[PDB]
DNA sequence: GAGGATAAAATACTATATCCTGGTTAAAGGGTTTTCT
DNA sequence: AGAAAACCCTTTTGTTATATAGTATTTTATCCTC
């Protein structure tokens, strides 16, 4: 089961992180392990100088959600990519998976 | 001034994340960052880098 | 290294089996708090 | 602040003055305060005794049910082994195929037995943790706490971070601790008395 | 064989005169906006 | 309408530490006992 996990990344730069993660999973071609990497991004509006204008905010700002089965090879692969500090979890030896209820919540919001 | 700036930034971010709703893990990490910021404010260099 | 008592004594008390366990133990000290694996350990040791 | 924060002076400076008040080693505080492990703030009681008898019965039921399911799985594996034997004896296949299929079957049976043993051991460990759950106990291995809370969501409260230490301090009388320490000073002797 | 108690080592913190003058004090990258062609 | 120069924000491998002397508190390792 591809339980979702969260990997931290440097502030600002996030898209390069996900793209390089995709490229690196291509490199070692462990496609049967990595399923999906997404950086949720809601679109909102603000009035700048008395004019309605758009804006793009990434809730959960600074982290990247990724699918990954818990193999140490996958662990090294994820930790290896540039600009990826580490796994936010219950301990270093094995990260912690976000519960299905939270992923359901983010899916509902991203849909909305 | 810089240390207070860091603390205020992190406090605002955590307040937003709590109000908007988020999984426990992200909130816990943000609280850790707040704890480290305050520790640095009161005594810089006592724990860690 | 058969001409000194110190080397033989160290050989007797090593507690390291084969070669892989040696690399994993080296990994456990060079870089703590990681999942030890032979490939990464060898790569890091060579690169150092 | 949107969440409680601990004052570094009373936590890091040697001797750790929070460590003495709560009777916790400095490493445990280093963990709980930096969100690296859970701590049992308050654990329920004599309600335990009754619910403990009832839950011993319930856990016996659960263990028997899981063992029955695993036994059914082993019976299915035995049926697979019988089918393998039928294939072996039906047509002409010498020692090679016989040994291959028998090794596979015995490996599968041993794996099923190991899984059963590990699950039963996990449940027994859960029972031990429950029957020996007291405050100021660190529950590392997040999955273990998640299992404990999902199964027995009552009978204790567990937290993690500064607010957990705040809760511990709130549920802490200052007179009983002083009485106990004075008793130990009078009688203890040794490093126990020294501490 | 298992548990408790004591040395050992291993880390953590603290301190190490008085006075004066001279040069510097942020960069670098990403994202966004306006003017010129 | 596209390109180039000018705003506004953010944030800062393990480096290199040639230390001593003293004390005080936590591991841990091993020895002694039951």
TrEMBL record, chain B:
DNA-dependent RNA polymerase catalyzes the transcription of DNA into RNA using the four ribonucleoside triphosphates as substrates. Belongs to the RNA polymerase beta' chain family. The RNAP catalytic core consists of 2 alpha, 1 beta, 1 beta' and 1 omega subunit. When a sigma factor is associated with the core the holoenzyme is formed, which can initiate transcription. This is DNA-directed RNA polymerase subunit beta'. The chain holds residues 341 to 389 of 1316 of the full protein.
């Amino acid at each position: 089961k591809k339980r979702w996990y969260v990997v931290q990344a440097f502030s600002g730069f996030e898209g390069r992180v996900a793209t390089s993660l995709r490229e690196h999973i291509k490199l070692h071609n462990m496609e049967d392990l990595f399923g999906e990497v997404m950086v949720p991004t809601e679109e909102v509006v603000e009035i700048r100088g008395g004019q309605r204008r758009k804006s793009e905010r990434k809730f959960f700002p600074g982290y990247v959600l990724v699918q990954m089965v818990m193999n140490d090879a996958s662990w090294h692969l994820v930790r290896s990519v540039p600009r990826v500090m580490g796994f936010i979890g219950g301990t270093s030896d094995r990260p912690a998976p976000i519960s299905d209820k939270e992923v359901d919540a983010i899916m509902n919001r991203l849909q909305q | 001034n810089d240390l207070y700036r860091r603390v205020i930034n992190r406090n605002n971010r955590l307040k937003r994340l709590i109000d908007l709703g988020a999984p426990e893990i992200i909130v816990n990490n943000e609280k850790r960052m707040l704890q480290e910021s305050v520790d640095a404010l009161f005594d810089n260099g006592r724990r860690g880098r | 290294f058969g001409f000194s008592e110190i080397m033989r004594s160290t050989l007797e008390k090593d507690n390291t089996v084969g070669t892989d366990e040696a690399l994993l133990d080296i990994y456990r000290k060079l870089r703590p708090g990681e999942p030890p694996t032979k490939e990464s350990a060898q790569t890091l040791l060579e690169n150092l | 602040l949107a969440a409680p924060v601990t004052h570094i002076w009373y936590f890091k400076g040697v001797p750790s003055r929070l460590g003495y008040l709560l009777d916790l080693a400095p490493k445990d505080l280093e963990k709980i305060i930096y969100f690296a492990a859970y701590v049992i703030t308050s654990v329920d009681e004599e309600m335990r005794h009754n619910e403990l008898s009832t839950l011993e019965a319930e856990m016996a039921v659960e263990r028997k049910a899981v063992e029955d399911q695993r036994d059914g799985e082993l019976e299915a594996r035995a049926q697979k082994l019988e089918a393998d034997l039928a294939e072996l004896e039906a047509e002409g296949a010498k020692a090679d195929a016989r040994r291959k299929v028998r090794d596979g079957g015995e490996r599968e049976m041993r794996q099923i037995r190991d899984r059963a043993q590990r699950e039963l051991d996990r449940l027994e460990d859960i029972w031990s943790t429950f029957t020996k759950l007291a405050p100021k106990q660190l529950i590392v291995d997040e999955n273990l706490y998640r299992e404990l809370v999902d199964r027995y969501g009552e009978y204790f409260t567990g937290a993690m971070g500064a607010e957990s230490i705040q809760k511990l301090i709130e549920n802490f009388d200052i007179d009983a601790e002083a009485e106990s320490l004075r008793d130990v000073i009078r009688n203890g002797k040794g490093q126990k008395k020294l501490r």
